[PDB]
Design a protein around this nucleic acid. Structure first.
Ligand SMILES: [Zn+2]
Ligand SMILES: [Zn+2]
Ligand SMILES: [Zn+2]
Length: 88
DNA sequence: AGCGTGGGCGT
DNA sequence: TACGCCCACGC
């Protein structure tokens, strides 16, 4: 695995396989937040994170617990992972 | 718990 | 370039 896209910001040595991945990373250095919620006007570094953020406004929870008799559901897959882990 | 926000990665 | 995921830490 070769990673030709290197970060040159001070004290950073991160490198990446893709240019969009590098550019995404560099936003953590610059504080740039190109993506704005049209509901609450909060701004975000990443479009995918804006997308899941917007679910906060609708209560959309596409990830349902599969445990018998459990009615819990979640906005994000990782919430469901943590929840299923908890059921054990 | 709910979700911000890095990491990774596919298409 | 765009769109979209899963992983998983931390508050
Ligand atoms: Zn960097
Ligand atoms: Zn919002
Ligand atoms: Zn459950």
């Amino acid at each position: 695995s070769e990673k030709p896209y290197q970060c040159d910001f001070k004290d950073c040595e991160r490198r990446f396989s893709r240019s969009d991945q590098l550019k995404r990373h560099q936003r953590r250095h610059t504080g740039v937040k190109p993506f704005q919620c049209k509901t609450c006007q909060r701004k975000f570094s990443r479009s995918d994170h804006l997308k899941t953020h917007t679910r906060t406004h609708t209560g959309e929870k596409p990830f349902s617990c599969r445990w018998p008799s459990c009615q819990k559901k979640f906005a994000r897959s990782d919430e469901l992972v943590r929840h299923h882990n908890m059921h054990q």
